Amino acid sequence: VKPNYALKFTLAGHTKAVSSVKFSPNGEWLASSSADKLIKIWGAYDGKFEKTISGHKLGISDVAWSSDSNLLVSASDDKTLKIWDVSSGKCLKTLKGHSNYVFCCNFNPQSNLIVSGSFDESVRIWDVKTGKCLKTLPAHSDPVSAVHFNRDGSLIVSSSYDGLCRIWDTASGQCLKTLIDDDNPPVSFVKFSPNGKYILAATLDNTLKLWDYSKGKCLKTYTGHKNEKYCIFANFSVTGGKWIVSGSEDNLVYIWNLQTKEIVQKLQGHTDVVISTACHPTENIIASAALENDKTIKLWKSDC
């Protein structure tokens, strides 16, 4: 069984590269961040432009939703994160502490903590309510490409240009595991599987790997895409068939069968690097976004 993703909507509005797209947990909205210093909100089903949220002094690299779909956090080249009330557009908190660009951010499932990674080679854990930094982790020896909480918030995975994936105890700040393969190319993206048992890791050798972090063993390898330069988001698609979804420097969205590792679809339409993909929480919908020669977001829908 293969999916049949077809283009439904193209979303234009950002005036510089799009950096990240994310669906709201409630499935109603897509958030986009851009080098143009803006967050835009769009209807997840109709692609209808909703609103712009502004206030960052420099480009935004990443955005993430709270579990109640009410807050966004953004990571900016201005060295801050901002917590936003989506309905009002209010900046609730400015999270200050990183000494260089803030590159990646996420809420924990409980949505009482934010994790951030920075070009300062640190990971920070923040209190959502106070905006206070709780822990600085000396995580890496080069820029941090990704940070992600597991399904119960007990672990953080981080990745770096240093070629390491690291698993952290949220409560203690202790480094529990460092994942090392037969070589250590730059790790451009990492995230936990929905069940928290696996980690999907992208490396700048045109390769995605599914790791059993408990066993510290590689289970699956996915190739055929182009990834030598950029930190491209990848996803587990779970609403229909069990897929891996990623962007590509050849301007395509790649979809693999998770178990068999075969490419099942390549989605054509973007005119620059596909830097970001996101999977809708309930419908077979993918959002993709491209860099500065394109600047569009596309919504794709499958029957399976």
Binding site for ligand ZHF (CB under 6 A): 17, 19-20, 61-62, 103-104, 143, 145, 160-161, 186, 188, 204, 229-231, 233, 275
Q: Which is nearer to ligand ZHF, 111 or 118 (CB)?
A: 118
Contacts of 283 (CB under 8 A, 6+ apart): 27, 44, 45, 239, 301
Minimum gap (Å) between residue 74 Cβ and ligand ZHF: 11
* Least distance (Å) between residue 113 CB and ligand ZHF: 19
Toward ligand ZHF, which CB reaches closer, 15 or 174? 15
Nearest approach, Cβ of 88 to ligand ZHF (angstroms)? 26
Cα–Cα distance between 231 and 257 in angstroms, integer? 22
Pick the closer one to ligand ZHF by CB: 273 or 302: 273
Nearer to ligand ZHF, 80 or 188 (CB): 188
The smaller minimum CB distance to ligand ZHF, of residues 18 and 284, is found at 18
CB of 274 to ligand ZHF, least distance (A): 10
Which of residues 144 and 299 has its CB atom nearest to ligand ZHF in the complex? 144
Long-range Cβ contact pairs of 127-133 (< 8 A, separation 24 or more) = 128/66, 128/71, 128/83, 128/93, 131/83, 131/92, 131/93, 131/94, 131/95, 133/95, 133/97
Nearer Cβ to ligand ZHF (95/231): 231
Residue 3 or residue 168: which is nearer to ligand ZHF going by CB? 168
What residues does 59 pair with on adjacent strands?
A: none
